[PDB]
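Complex record, six chains
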Amino acid sequence: TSQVRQNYHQDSEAAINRQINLELYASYVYLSMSYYFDRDDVALKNFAKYFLHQSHEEREHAEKLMKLQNQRGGRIFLQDIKKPDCDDWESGLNAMECALHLEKNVNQSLLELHKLATDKNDPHLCDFIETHYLNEQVKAIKELGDHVTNLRKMGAPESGLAEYLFDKHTLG
Amino acid sequence: TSQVRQNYHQDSEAAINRQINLELYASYVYLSMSYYFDRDDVALKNFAKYFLHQSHEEREHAEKLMKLQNQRGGRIFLQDIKKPDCDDWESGLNAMECALHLEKNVNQSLLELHKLATDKNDPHLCDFIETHYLNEQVKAIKELGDHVTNLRKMGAPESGLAEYLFDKHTLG
Amino acid sequence: TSQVRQNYHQDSEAAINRQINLELYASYVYLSMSYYFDRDDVALKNFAKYFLHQSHEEREHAEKLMKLQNQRGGRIFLQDIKKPDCDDWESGLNAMECALHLEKNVNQSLLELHKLATDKNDPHLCDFIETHYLNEQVKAIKELGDHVTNLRKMGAPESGLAEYLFDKHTLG
Amino acid sequence: TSQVRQNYHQDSEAAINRQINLELYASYVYLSMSYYFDRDDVALKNFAKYFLHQSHEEREHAEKLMKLQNQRGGRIFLQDIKKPDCDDWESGLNAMECALHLEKNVNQSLLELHKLATDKNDPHLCDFIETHYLNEQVKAIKELGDHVTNLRKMGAPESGLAEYLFDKHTLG
Amino acid sequence: TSQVRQNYHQDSEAAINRQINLELYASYVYLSMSYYFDRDDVALKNFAKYFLHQSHEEREHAEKLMKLQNQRGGRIFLQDIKKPDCDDWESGLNAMECALHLEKNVNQSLLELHKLATDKNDPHLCDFIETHYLNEQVKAIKELGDHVTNLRKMGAPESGLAEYLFDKHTLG
Amino acid sequence: TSQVRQNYHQDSEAAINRQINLELYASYVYLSMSYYFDRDDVALKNFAKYFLHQSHEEREHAEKLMKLQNQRGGRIFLQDIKKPDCDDWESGLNAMECALHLEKNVNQSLLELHKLATDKNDPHLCDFIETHYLNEQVKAIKELGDHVTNLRKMGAPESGLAEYLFDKHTLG
C-alpha cells in the first residue's frame, strides 16, 4: 500500500484502466484512416493532415490519465489493443460517420465514470473529469456534426466534385 | 586512355549515353506540352507554369550525368533528338496520362542500369543512382498519380468545369 | 492492381506489415516504462523525460514506413498490439537491459529485411533501409551500451546513490 | 481557324518554325562545347561557365518566339534536332571560330526573315524583330570578334600559356 | 566478447586496421611535401598552404574510421608508420604526380574493401563506405587530374615562369 | 650549402630531427588513449575530448619546429614512428601515470638540447626554447600532477564512483 493513497477506492482503479485502454484504441483507429486517404486511388490530401492531427491529441488524453493515475497512487495495468473494424472506409462521407459513431461511444463511457465517481464520494475525480474532458468531447461532436451535414447536403458521395471542393474551402 | 580512369568498364560508358539522350528527349517533350495549353482555344494558364517548370529540372538531371561522365574520365557521344509523338494533346486529362506514361519508361530504364552496375561491381555508380535519381522518380510518379485520379473522379474531360476549378485550387 | 505499382513483389508487402507492427509494439513498450519511473516509490524524474522522448521517435519510424508503403502502391494490413512482457521493471539498471535487449531484436529483423530486399533485386528498397534506419539503430545501441556500463561500474542497483547521481549529471 | 488571327499570312507561320528549330539546334551545340572543356585533358574551367551560360539564353530566345507564335494565333510544328558537326573541338582558339562561324549564320537567317516580313506588310512582326533580336546578335558578334583576335595575337594555340592567362584575366 | 557486437565478422576487423594504417601514412606523406616547398631554394608559398591543408582532412578520415570501429564494438590494433619514399621531390610538377600516384592506391584499396563487405553480407558497412569515402576520392582525383594537365601544357618544369604564375592565379 | 645559413652548426641539425620525431611519437600516443576511453566497456566520454585535445597541440609543437628548421636553412630528415607501448590502459588512474611518465621524458630531452645549444654559442636557439617550450611543459606537468593526486585520494580505481564523479565536476 502506497504512502500517498488517500480516499481512493479500489473500484475506480479498475475503471480507469478500462478508460485508458479505450483511448489508445481510439488513437489507433484514426491512424488507420489518416493514411487511407493518402492512397493514390483516393488522394484527398488534407483529410490526412486533419485526421492525423486528431490522433496526436487523443493520445495526449490517454497520456494525461496515466499522469493522474499516479498522483493518487494507483497502479497501471495495460491490455492489448484491438485492430480497427473495417480496413476499407470506401469514401469520405462514410468515413466521418464511423468517426462520429466512435466519439459518442467514448462520451458514453465517461458519463458512467462520473456517475461511479459520485457514489464513492470522491470529489477530486468529479471536478477533474468535469473539466478536462466533458467540455472537450462536446465541441468535437458538434464539429463533426457539421462536416457530416455539409457533405450530405452537397450531394456526396454520388458527386465526387462535392468532396473535392469541400477539401480546399474548409480544411485549407 | 585518360589518366584518371579507374575501374570503369567500357560497357557502362555506352549505357550512359543512351540514358542522357533519353533525358533530353523527355525535357523536349514537356516543352511541347507546356506551350500547347497556352493556345487561345484551351487557355489554362497554370498548366503552362507547371509543365514548363518540369522541363527545367529534367534538363538539370541530364546536365548532372554529363558532369559525372567526366569525373570517371569517360567520353560523351551525342545523338539526335526525336520529336514528340503527338502534337495535339486534346485535353487536360489525356495530357497527364501520356506524361505519366512517360515517366515509368524513364524509371524502367534506370532499374536495368543499376542492375548492369551491379554485375561489373562498380560501387560508386551503385550508390550514386541509389541517391540522386531513384528516390526522385518515385515522388514524381506518386504526385502525377494523384492529379490523374482527381480529374477522373471529378468528371473531366466531359465537364470542363472540373478542369477549370482544379486549376486554381491546386496549382495556384 | 494499382496504376503506380512497378517492380514491387508481393512478398515484401507481407514483410513490411510485420515490420510496422513490430515498431508500434516497441513504442508501446517505452510508454509503459516511462510512466513506471514516475511512481512515488521510485521517483526518478528524468528517466520519464528520457524514455517518453524515445517513444515519440520510434512512432515516427513506424509512421515513416507507412508513408513508403503507399509510394510503391502497396496495401496496409494492421494487426493487434501485444502488451509488454513485465509490468514491474524493479530498478533502473534492470530497465536498461530489457530495453537494450529490445533494440537488438529490432536491428535483427531489419538485416533479414535488407537480405530479402536483395534477392528480389529491388534497388529502391535497398538504399532506403541502407539510409534511414540501419545508421540510426547503431547509434542507439552504442548509447544504451554506455549507460548500462556506467551504472554497473558505479555499483547500482545495490547502492541507490549511484542511480540518483547518475540522473542529474547525465540526463540533465 | 482561330478567332484571334488577324493579318497573319500562312507563309510566315512556316518561316518561324524553321527559325525556332534553328535556335534549339544552336543551344544544343553550346551544351556540347561547354562540357568538352571540362575534360581532364583540357581543364579550362571558366570556358565551361562561359559557354554553359550562353546556352541558357539562346534557349530563352527560342522560348520567346513560341510565346509570340501563339499571340498571333499560329500553330507550332516541331522537327527533330540534329547533333553537332564535330565532337572534338581540339583547342580553345579553334572553338571560338566555329562558334563565331555559327552566329553569323543565325544572323543571316533573320535578315531574310525581316525581308519576308516586309513583303506581306505585317508591321507588328517588323518592329518586333527590329527590337528583341537584331540588336542582340550584333553585340554578340562584336564580343566574340575580340576574343578571337586576342588569342590569335597572343600566340595561341601554339603556346598554351596564352590560353591559360587569358582565362583568369578576362572571364574571371 | 562485447555486448553490442552484432553481425560483425572477425575478418573485417582485420581489414579496417590495414585501412586506418594506410590513412595516417598518407597524412604523414603530405606533411613532408608541404614543408618541402617552404625551403628557400624553392619558395612557392601557396603550395605549402595547399598541401598542409590536405593533411588535416586525410587525418579526419583516419579519425572517422576509428569512431566507426567502436560503434560496432571492434578493437583497435595500431602498427608503425613508414616514412615517405623520396625526400627530395625536385619540382612542382613531379610532386603532383607522386601525389596523384598516391590517391589511386588509396582508392584501389577501398574497392576491395567494399567487395569484401558484400560477401559477409553486412549492409551497414556497405552503405557507409558507399557514402563518406567513395564519393570524395573521385572529386579529389579529378582535381589533381587538372593541375597535372595545366602545368604540363604550360611548359613546366622547363620554364619556371609557368610554375610561378600558376601559383597566384589558381591557389590564391 | 644554402645562402641563408649563418652560425648554425651541423650538430644541432642532427639534434632537432631527433626532437621532432619524439614529438610526433607523443602525439601518436595520445590518439591511441583518447579512443580507448570511447569503448563501450569503459565509456568515460570527456576523457576522449580531453586527450584528443592534447593530441592537436603536441602536433603543432612538432609543426612549429619544422618551421624553425627552415628559417635557419637546415634540412629535414624524417624517420619512422613507433607504435605505443601498451594497448590496454586498463583504467583511468593508470592512464594518467603513463601519460605523466611520458611528459617528463620530453622535458628531459629539451634540457639537454638547451645545454647543447649553449656550447655552440648560438643565442637565437637559446632564447627560442627558453620561450615557446620550457614554460609550457612546466604547466602541463603541474596540471597532470593534480589529476593524479585527486583520483588517488578519492579512492580510484577501486571505487568506480570516484572516476565517474571526477569526470563531470572537473573536465565538464
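Note: The radius of gyration of chain D is 19 Å.
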